[PDB]
Amino acid sequence: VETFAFQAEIAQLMSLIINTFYSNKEIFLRELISNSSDALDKIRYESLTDPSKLDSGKELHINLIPNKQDRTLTIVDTGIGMTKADLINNLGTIAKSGTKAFMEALQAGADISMIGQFGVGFYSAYLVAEKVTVITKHNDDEQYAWESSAGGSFTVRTDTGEPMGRGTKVILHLKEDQTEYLEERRIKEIVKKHSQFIGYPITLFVE
Numbered sequence: 001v002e003t004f005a006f007q008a009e010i011a012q013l014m015s016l017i018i019n020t021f022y023s024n025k026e027i028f029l030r031e032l033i034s035n036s037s038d039a040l041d042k043i044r045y046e047s048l049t050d051p052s053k054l055d056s057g058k059e060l061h062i063n064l065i066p067n068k069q070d071r072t073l074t075i076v077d078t079g080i081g082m083t084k085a086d087l088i089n090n091l092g093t094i095a096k097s098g099t100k101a102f103m104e105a106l107q108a109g110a111d112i113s114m115i116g117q118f119g120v121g122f123y124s125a126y127l128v129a130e131k132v133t134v135i136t137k138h139n140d141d142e143q144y145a146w147e148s149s150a151g152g153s154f155t156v157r158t159d160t161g162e163p164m165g166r167g168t169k170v171i172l173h174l175k176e177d178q179t180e181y182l183e184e185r186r187i188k189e190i191v192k193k194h195s196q197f198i199g200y201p202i203t204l205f206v207e
């Protein structure tokens with residue numbers, strides 16, 4: 001288990017998301033589904049030049065898994081996945097410029113729902129989640145588990161759990177007052193409203 005400090009700009013962004021009064025929390029789902037969609041586009045692209053990249057799984061889909069017992073909402077995709085380098089430094093560094101631009105926009109009159117237009121859409125998970133776990137598997141790397149309850153740090157470890165093949169699993173450990181996001185009709189309503197034109201099948205699992 002390795003512990004890392006978030007880059008200063010990211011930590012500020014996470015504090016902003018956790019502390020600002022913002023009722024329109026549902027936008028987190030569209031951001032996560034959109035990222036899943038982009039990771040699926042990437043793998044499909046790489047498969048045109050190298051068809052052997054689909055050996056780790058041919059199906060390109062998005063699964064929404066609520067679990068009321070565990071109070072978790074899981075977003076699973078069979079996309080490109082991420083390497084340990086993507087989890088640690090790479091994604092944090094591209095986010096640096098996006099965060100600055102986003103924080104400047106909020107000061108200029110923009111709202112939190114515009115987060116994805118700055119490429120930092122992921123962190124909107126912190127509107128609803130007290131902890132986020134990211135399980136990922138890229139073709140050129142091992143299965144890793146990223147985790148953060150915010151507070152300026154995240155952890156990375158080799159995941160010894162159930163193998164995935166290829167893709168990313170985002171586990172949202174929901175805050176006590178955000179259980180509506182485990183309800184079928186609420187999820188259906190959000191997906192219909194915000195993710196009506198995603199080019200992959202989205203399956204909402206039942207409990």
Ligand SMILES: N#C[C@H](CC1CCCCC1)c1n[nH]c2cc(O)ccc12
Binds near residue numbers: 032039040079091134
């Ligand atoms: N971008 C992005 C995040 C990854 C997150 C990893 C840990 C550091 C912060 C970014 C993300 N959210 N949802 C996804 C779905 C994917 O198929 C791949 C990446 C993501």
